[PDB]
Amino acid sequence: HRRYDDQLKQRRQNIRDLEKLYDKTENDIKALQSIGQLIGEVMKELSEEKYIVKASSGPRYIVGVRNSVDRSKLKKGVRVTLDITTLTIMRILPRETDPLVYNMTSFEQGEITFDGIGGLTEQIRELREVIELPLKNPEIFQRVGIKPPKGVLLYGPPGTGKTLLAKAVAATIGANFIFSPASGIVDKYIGESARIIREMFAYAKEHEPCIIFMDEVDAIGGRRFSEGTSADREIQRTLMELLTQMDGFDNLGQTKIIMATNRPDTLDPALLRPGRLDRKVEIPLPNEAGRLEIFKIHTAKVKKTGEFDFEAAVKMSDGFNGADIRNCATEAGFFAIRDDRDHINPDDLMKAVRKVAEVKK
Amino acid sequence: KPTETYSDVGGLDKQIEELVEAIVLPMKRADKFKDMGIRAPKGALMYGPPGTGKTLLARACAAQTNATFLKLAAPQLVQMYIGEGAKLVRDAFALAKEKAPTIIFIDELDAIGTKRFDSEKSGDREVQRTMLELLNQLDGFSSDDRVKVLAATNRVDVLDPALLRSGRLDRKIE
Amino acid sequence: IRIFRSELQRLSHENNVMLEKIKDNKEKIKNNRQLPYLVANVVEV
């Protein structure tokens, strides 16, 4: 008859579990009685206690303040929380217009490590001193009396060195990775490139530890002749706005602007002048000594034979980064099925060269 | 599971050799690639004139592995309100859950796949967010051979190295 | 059969305390939810 004591502790847990489940139901009942609010952005600052806003759910309104209003973080052009009845501002919201978390890629710190960018150490060491230092300790250059550079141009073959150097710099520094390609700028719209740079500048203003990266900037550049617009609407608005942000009254000291293209001669020399872009860095192809450490990441991670020779496929490899070797090891598995082996061979990896040589030169 | 074979349309064996290698082999038996640790490709880029076998061998490759045929039309991916075609990325993935295998097709990739020199994907957000949802869904199952995404169109203009890798559309099959 | 019946009555009665507590909550949680639901999409969680 004493065996029922084991069920006493088991049933008592169910009494405590159901009591917590029924309590969460009452909390959901009390949560439905809550009243939400609206959202908008300040169009104009009339005074300190009055802000001209624009409602997303209705026409333009002019609202007041309620409580916990920080006048430093809240100013003209900042997203607010509108009231449906009294038309007041309650909560302060960050500035967002376009899908900055969709059209723009934002990731915490970096992804790609230093082992993939290896071989550039001589150049990277000089770049980290003018980039990593002002982001960590801004007082280094203040005692010297100089200013850190803003734009840094990384150019080379498409897909080679553009993705690696983008996520590697943000990984060693600790700043967030911002990917905003130049292909999201020039379109058919009224003032698209005007609001892309402003919202991109607003995101870097809210979060200081961030670095902006771009891609394929050759389409948004060019000097034309007199540096005006002829049958290109969105190119000139991009050329001038990028010049006024860095050389204006408010620049990004905690955010560096990065561009990527095939050649620097295809851009507008107006943006290549000192004061904005101070650095031109060419991305070459990795040599036999440079590619030795490339195949040691992805190819060395997958299961391979102990006698596998790395140097056998390096001489036949041309311009293969950490992303390109994923396909080389993948294409090597197709030719290794005929040999009935659970691993890869150095001669089977060399068979992925001529297969790619049919497309690329 | 459409009903088709490779003998119904002949003369494409030159292209079929590239299709079976990048579709049937990584899907049917994945135990050869999983023992090596490498990731099998989930798709191959296809381009060519209409009626040349790009849409003809679509159901053929799905019938060999017994997979569900899902076709995405280009005019169906552009709407007014944000939604519709943008949800088809999750809709085609929703049918992939219950059904054991899957193969996803995209007709006329050049509509949503070619940005040219224009950002107009920002103008109509159903086109851009469709490509954005693909990057999240293609990275959902890395080692699963039962989720495949394919596309077919006329030509190829804009290249996206972020889309070129194992597990996405990479190899160009003309 | 003897000691177990003493503690079982306490747990059985406390289970009835939350039973009458959820009985009024089941009527509220179903009625407070609006049956003509409107289509909406959350932009940011």
Side-chain angles (χ1 to χ4, degrees):
Chain A
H1 300 290
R2 294 182 182 175
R3 294 182 182 175
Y4 295 93
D5 290 344
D6 290 344
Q7 294 177 336
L8 177 63
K9 294 177 179 177
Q10 294 178 336
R11 294 183 181 276
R12 181 177 181 171
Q13 294 177 336
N14 290 336
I15 302 301
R16 297 295 181 190
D17 289 344
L18 294 175
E19 183 178 2
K20 294 177 179 177
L21 295 175
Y22 296 143
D23 181 67
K24 294 177 179 177
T25 300
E26 183 179 2
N27 290 336
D28 291 345
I29 295 170
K30 294 177 179 178
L32 296 175
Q33 294 178 336
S34 63
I35 296 170
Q37 297 302 322
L38 296 175
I39 185 169
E41 183 180 2
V42 175
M43 296 297 103
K44 178 62 173 172
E45 183 178 2
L46 177 63
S47 63
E48 294 177 350
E49 294 178 350
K50 294 177 179 177
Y51 296 139
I52 296 170
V53 297
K54 183 178 179 180
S56 296
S57 296
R60 294 182 182 175
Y61 296 139
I62 297 171
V63 296
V65 296
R66 179 60 178 165
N67 58 33
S68 296
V69 176
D70 186 5
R71 294 181 182 174
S72 64
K73 294 177 179 177
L74 177 62
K75 63 182 178 181
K76 182 174 177 290
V78 177
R79 297 292 181 189
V80 298
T81 300
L82 297 177
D83 186 5
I84 186 169
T85 301
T86 60
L87 295 174
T88 59
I89 293 171
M90 293 178 71
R91 300 289 182 268
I92 295 171
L93 295 175
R95 294 173 296 181
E96 183 178 2
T97 299
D98 290 343
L100 296 175
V101 295
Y102 295 95
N103 189 29
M104 177 178 71
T105 299
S106 178
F107 180 79
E108 183 178 2
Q109 295 178 336
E111 294 180 352
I112 303 301
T113 59
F114 177 80
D115 290 344
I117 62 171
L120 295 175
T121 301
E122 183 178 2
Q123 294 300 321
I124 302 301
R125 179 60 178 165
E126 294 178 350
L127 295 175
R128 295 176 63 185
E129 296 301 320
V130 297
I131 295 171
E132 182 178 2
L133 272 65
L135 297 176
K136 292 166 62 180
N137 290 283
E139 71 280 5
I140 295 171
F141 59 88
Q142 294 178 336
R143 294 182 182 175
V144 177
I146 61 101
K147 294 177 179 177
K150 301 292 184 291
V152 175
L153 177 62
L154 296 174
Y155 63 91
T160 299
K162 294 177 179 177
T163 300
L164 296 176
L165 295 175
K167 294 176 179 177
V169 175
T172 59
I173 296 171
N176 290 337
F177 177 80
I178 293 171
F179 178 80
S180 178
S183 63
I185 295 171
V186 174
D187 58 352
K188 294 177 179 177
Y189 180 75
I190 295 98
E192 180 67 14
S193 62
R195 62 175 184 183
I196 298 300
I197 297 170
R198 295 177 63 186
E199 295 302 321
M200 177 178 71
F201 177 81
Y203 177 78
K205 179 62 174 172
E206 294 177 351
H207 294 82
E208 294 178 350
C210 295
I211 297 170
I212 294 169
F213 296 94
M214 295 177 71
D215 187 5
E216 294 178 350
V217 297
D218 59 352
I220 63 172
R223 62 179 296 275
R224 190 178 65 84
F225 297 97
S226 64
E227 295 176 350
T229 181
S230 178
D232 288 341
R233 186 55 57 91
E234 295 301 321
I235 293 172
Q236 293 301 321
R237 179 59 181 165
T238 301
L239 297 174
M240 183 64 72
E241 183 67 15
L242 293 174
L243 178 63
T244 58
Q245 294 300 321
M246 297 297 103
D247 290 344
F249 59 91
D250 186 5
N251 59 33
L252 294 174
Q254 294 300 321
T255 300
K256 302 299 183 181
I257 303 301
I258 304 300
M259 294 183 286
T261 187
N262 290 337
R263 182 177 181 171
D265 290 344
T266 59
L267 296 175
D268 186 6
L271 296 176
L272 274 64
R273 70 172 64 197
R276 181 179 180 274
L277 177 64
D278 290 344
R279 298 296 180 191
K280 294 177 179 178
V281 176
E282 182 178 2
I283 296 170
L285 296 175
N287 61 344
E288 183 178 2
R291 291 192 297 273
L292 178 63
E293 296 301 321
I294 302 301
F295 295 98
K296 293 176 179 177
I297 297 170
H298 294 83
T299 301
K301 183 178 179 180
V302 298
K303 294 177 179 177
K304 62 181 181 296
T305 59
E307 294 178 350
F308 177 80
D309 186 5
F310 296 96
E311 294 177 350
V314 175
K315 294 177 179 177
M316 294 300 294
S317 63
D318 187 5
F320 294 161
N321 58 32
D324 290 344
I325 61 172
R326 294 182 182 175
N327 292 336
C328 296
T330 299
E331 295 301 321
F334 296 96
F335 296 96
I337 295 171
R338 294 182 182 175
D339 290 344
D340 187 6
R341 185 182 296 275
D342 290 344
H343 300 290
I344 61 172
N345 290 283
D347 290 344
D348 290 343
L349 178 62
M350 293 176 70
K351 293 181 181 297
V353 176
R354 294 182 182 175
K355 301 302 287 185
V356 177
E358 294 178 350
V359 176
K360 293 184 175 74
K361 180 179 76 179
Chain B
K1 292 177 178 177
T3 299
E4 186 178 2
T5 59
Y6 295 93
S7 63
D8 290 344
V9 177
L12 295 176
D13 290 344
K14 183 178 179 180
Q15 295 84 0
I16 294 171
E17 183 178 2
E18 294 178 350
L19 294 175
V20 175
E21 183 178 2
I23 296 170
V24 176
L25 295 176
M27 181 172 175
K28 183 178 179 180
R29 300 289 182 268
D31 290 344
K32 302 299 182 181
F33 297 96
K34 292 177 179 177
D35 290 344
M36 295 177 182
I38 60 172
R39 182 179 65 256
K42 270 67 180 180
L45 178 62
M46 295 182 286
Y47 63 91
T52 58
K54 61 181 179 181
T55 59
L56 296 175
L57 295 175
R59 294 182 182 175
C61 295
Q64 185 64 59
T65 59
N66 290 336
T68 300
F69 177 80
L70 296 175
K71 183 178 179 180
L72 297 176
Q76 295 299 321
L77 296 175
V78 176
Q79 295 298 320
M80 176 178 71
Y81 176 75
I82 295 170
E84 298 300 322
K87 179 61 174 172
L88 294 175
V89 177
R90 294 182 182 175
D91 289 343
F93 178 80
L95 296 175
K97 293 182 69 66
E98 295 84 358
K99 181 62 174 172
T102 301
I103 295 172
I104 295 170
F105 296 97
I106 295 171
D107 181 67
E108 296 301 321
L109 178 63
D110 288 344
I112 62 172
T114 59
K115 62 183 178 182
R116 293 173 296 180
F117 296 97
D118 290 343
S119 299
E120 63 184 343
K121 294 177 179 177
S122 296
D124 291 344
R125 294 182 181 175
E126 297 84 358
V127 175
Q128 186 174 356
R129 295 184 183 177
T130 299
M131 295 299 294
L132 295 175
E133 295 301 321
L134 294 174
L135 296 175
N136 291 336
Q137 294 301 322
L138 293 174
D139 290 344
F141 296 97
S142 64
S143 64
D144 187 6
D145 59 352
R146 293 173 296 180
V147 176
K148 301 299 183 181
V149 175
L150 295 174
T153 187
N154 290 336
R155 66 184 182 276
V156 175
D157 291 344
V158 176
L159 296 175
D160 187 4
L163 294 174
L164 297 175
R165 70 171 64 196
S166 296
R168 294 182 181 175
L169 297 174
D170 186 7
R171 185 176 179 84
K172 294 177 179 177
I173 295 170
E174 182 178 2
Chain C
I1 187 169
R2 297 295 181 190
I3 296 171
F4 177 80
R5 293 182 182 175
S6 178
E7 295 301 321
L8 178 63
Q9 185 63 59
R10 181 177 65 84
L11 295 175
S12 296
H13 187 280
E14 293 177 350
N15 191 30
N16 290 337
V17 175
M18 67 190 85
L19 178 63
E20 294 178 351
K21 183 178 179 180
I22 193 66
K23 183 178 179 180
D24 290 344
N25 290 336
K26 292 176 179 177
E27 294 177 350
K28 290 189 295 184
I29 191 65
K30 294 177 179 177
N31 290 336
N32 290 336
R33 294 176 63 185
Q34 186 174 355
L35 178 62
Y37 295 96
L38 176 62
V39 176
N41 291 283
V42 175
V43 176
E44 183 178 2
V45 176

